[PDB]
Subunit: 324 residues, 4 copies
């Protein structure tokens, strides 16, 4: 049986493997749990045979020079880490794979969720009824509106982009996407209309922010640029918008909105965002679902099985061209 070192922290085997998957995994491999701060500490025997690393440990040239069978490192924190001589793991042919796309479907779903909540006031309609201020249907629907309509714009488009395009595929709506690093040919074939940020921002009833582009726009001036009763949905990275610029457009009652991410987390208790009518709130929980984490396990398993049978990993994301 091939040997794999486990050093998944701050993730863990218990979290990322269903029973079925965990049994499959140990039935198939010797999985030695190991201290990530001390990989070098392992058996000079253990290091000689390791074909895989599940996780993201610190590593150095000398300890890496000790691992002649290492085939791949499977990153399970969604994020690449300035952690080890990537140059030599490239020289050697050693793939580094990531499992972050597990968080797409979770985030799409709750994302379409807010879209429908805003476009029909599902929340305000529940609180009003809850305490007792109806408007009994028809009378509620001043500002109601279908998504099937309908002009959708996506700011960014990676995995979260695609997951969203998928859930929306039942709405026969119009989907404008802005993305710098995807050719117009690839967008068109993903079922979307490649577009300027200004088109997306402007000719759109529903706007989703979904990926950074990059590193770090959309301020007071970007918001006014919108259509009147516009739906603006923030799913990734709060640092890209001016929050108070955004709140301003909401109280003003220009656009309507919902975010899952905030300029500070957790947000202080006194913070304005809490009282603002017309803004749906979500405590950075769009992606952390158990089943998302159990999927990481499945992926790892698929990718191991390919590399065991000599083939390149397919399932988790590869890395290459990223100095940082």
């Amino acid at each position: 049986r091939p040997l794999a070192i486990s050093a998944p922290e701050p993730r863990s085997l218990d979290l990322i493997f269903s029973d079925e998957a965990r049994a499959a995994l140990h039935s198939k491999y010797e999985i030695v749990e190991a201290d990530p701060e001390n990989i070098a500490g392992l058996g000079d025997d253990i290091l000689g045979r390791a074909r895989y690393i599940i996780g993201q440990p610190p590593l150095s040239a000398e300890t890496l020079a000790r691992m002649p069978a290492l085939r791949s490192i499977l990153n399970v924190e969604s994020n690449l880490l300035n952690n080890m001589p990537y140059e030599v793991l490239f020289q050697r042919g050693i793939h580094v794979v990531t499992t972050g796309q597990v968080f797409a479907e979770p985030v799409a779903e709750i994302g379409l969720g807010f879209a429908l909540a805003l476009a029909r006031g599902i929340v305000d309609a529940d609180i009003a009824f809850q305490e007792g201020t109806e408007l009994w249907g028809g009378e509620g629907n001043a500002s109601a509106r279908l998504i099937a309509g309908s002009e959708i714009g996506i700011v960014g488009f990676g995995d979260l982009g695609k997951a969203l395009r998928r859930v929306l595929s039942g709405f026969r709506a119009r989907i404008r996407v802005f993305d710098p690093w995807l050719p117009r040919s690839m967008l068109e074939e993903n079922g979307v209309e490649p577009a300027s940020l200004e088109d997306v921002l402007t000719k759109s009833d529903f706007i989703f922010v979904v990926a950074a582009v990059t590193s770090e726009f959309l301020g007071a001036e970007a918001f006014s640029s919108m259509r009147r009763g516009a739906a603006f949905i923030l799913l990734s990275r709060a640092d890209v918008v001016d929050f108070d610029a955004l709140m301003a457009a909401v109280s003003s009652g220009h656009i309507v909105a919902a975010s899952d991410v905030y300029p500070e987390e957790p947000l202080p208790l006194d913070h304005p965002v809490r009282s603002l009518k017309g803004f749906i709130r979500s405590a950075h929980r769009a992606g952390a679902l158990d089943s998302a984490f159990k999927k990481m396990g499945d992926m790892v398993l698929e990718d191991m099985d390919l590399m065991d049978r000599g083939l390149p990993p397919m399932r988790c994301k590869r890395a290459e061209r990223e100095t940082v």
Copy 2:
């Protein structure tokens, strides 16, 4: 040009018509507004020749035999009314048409809204965030799940079910449907999987309804979602309520037994429930369609064409 009685019920011509289809109507038809409850007392020059009624007005045989012209009654209130002689219309060959399909999309749409909200605690995540109650990231999500790859069951299958099917498209869920009337082999070529009411209840994470209750609520899954969208008469409402209060299930409704509802009613106090004041279908875009749906049918029957557009009413006279 030809003649049409305009007597819609709570629906007015204003509401169910955009300027476009409105101005195209007298432009195309001689149309006369008329008290819907006094339709016999319209001028007999009129009765004898008018060929379409746009409304749901009550009609007696006497008022009927004086409409030899009349080829269809076009109803703009979704549900057929025990209102007239539905036996003469048949011989006379008169069509009664329904425009009720226009509530399929908006209800589907808001149905997916509840499910995702039920599935993910959207509403009580928000209410909490108002009040400072919180729980960030993974702490809030103990019983938050995906709909994609989940098991959905529908009860009945209207236009509403076809509309629900369509919106679910991108979820790749297992769609079990239970519906007596429509032949087993017609759901198959419509996307969904035919199934006994048992499975639809016992083996669905999400159950949509488009008589029953109590034991049924106990036969449902671990922490499954009930989403109720039409015909309140079918659920024992207290049985649902306790089934919700127990914690055994989570639920959402757009229909209620007393409508409007008592201000005392305890549902409004009820954790694990999401309320809507019958607002699933009542959308201006929905209303405006009825109009165009009507014109299309009129124009069609003018050629003398058995209309395809609106819904018809065959052996559903028995009820």
Copy 3:
């Protein structure tokens, strides 16, 4: 349970599978009649009789009429059926799928010279490249036109799903709204003929005027009913290299052994065989059977 079986032209041996007659016996029972105890109590009817205003009043316990030969074999007591109540429906929809599939078939072959490249290969004269593909084009993203849109149009539209094309349909009967939600763009006949790369004909004369109107590379597929087509004009259009075409139906079926189409380069011929599949007849049973088990529940079909 009672039903009347005047199948001919169609059999019962051949419009039901095993499980399908197996079930029709053990849930009903039936006759070996002649479309030209009984009279009164009869609930159903699997046939195409002219029977017959008098013989009708004699059958007062009737529910539904089941034409198992697509077309309505008139005459029934036309008005004393809708005034009386009894039900009139067809099985004709089973032919939709088979016609569609083979329609796409002809399209692809016209689109890529499949038949010509198999003949060439046989006769030793095939171009390999590259070089064999000068007129080869792709159906994907390509502007297809349909003329008519019955049960048939629908099936076509469905086998086309995965092609990603702009589909234009000319149909005066169906209201714009029904087509557009049904996945197609509604259009005027000119805007079809003139603006399509592949035109399919499904359901008083289409002639020389039209064929000149079509785009120069265009492909003309004829699937139902010759009558509305100027057969001569069609043959001149193809003959001149203006268009390529294909047709399952002809001015006269069978067609004379000496008919100039039998040797017209650019034209794919099929002998009125779009719809006649064994599986379509077997689906006929299912259809009537399921809709019987519905009628005897006070429900429509």
Copy 4:
């Protein structure tokens, strides 16, 4: 000074793979040097030292490669890697080799579905019958004539071609089983297919597109099964296939063959139940044009320093194999 690319596309050409709009963009944005594929070494040091891309598949030596410090990628326009390079020293330098083969998936898939309906329904024969006069009219003709709609379909392989084959089959709502052991089963499933063992595909499918395999393979298929072979004859026992076809066990269609061009002698030229195609499934002009368009899309990404995305990337293990 604009980035320089070396063009050596033979057996293809710039005239063929670039359309007008695209060929102009290419020379606006790039300094394209046309080279003789057998002599890249001879180009100036001035060119070799400044070159950033190669369009085509020229034989290259570590020797030459060493003289190319700026080389970012080799954009291979024949669809197939050649063993004419030190693949070790690429990779090393992070020089990408990409492939333009995806332009074939769509044309190959349409003709593939076109071969299946031909088989399913005797389109070729029926036309030939009408030509000659012999001649069955609708019903007696369709004795051995099925739908694809309800059927069970099977795919051996699944790259771009499978995907395109899955797209065009989507209107038919069939059950599609596919064997691809280079894809993880989750990736198959999200692509709308049911992953399946080789022998299930072989034994449980009314239609089999190929996208080992000899007499036991053929004898295991269901009795009326159609077998559509679209890529690389390399993997069928062509003699067994013909035997299987002539006995009336299966009907079949191929666009590829054991020697190409075939000899005029060849048995498969006279064989019934076989639809023939002269390796033309994928060579359409519009297809060759799409290579120019991809090549340019990828050169753009790399000028911006991103990795390639529109063309497929040569992986150490493929080049190993």
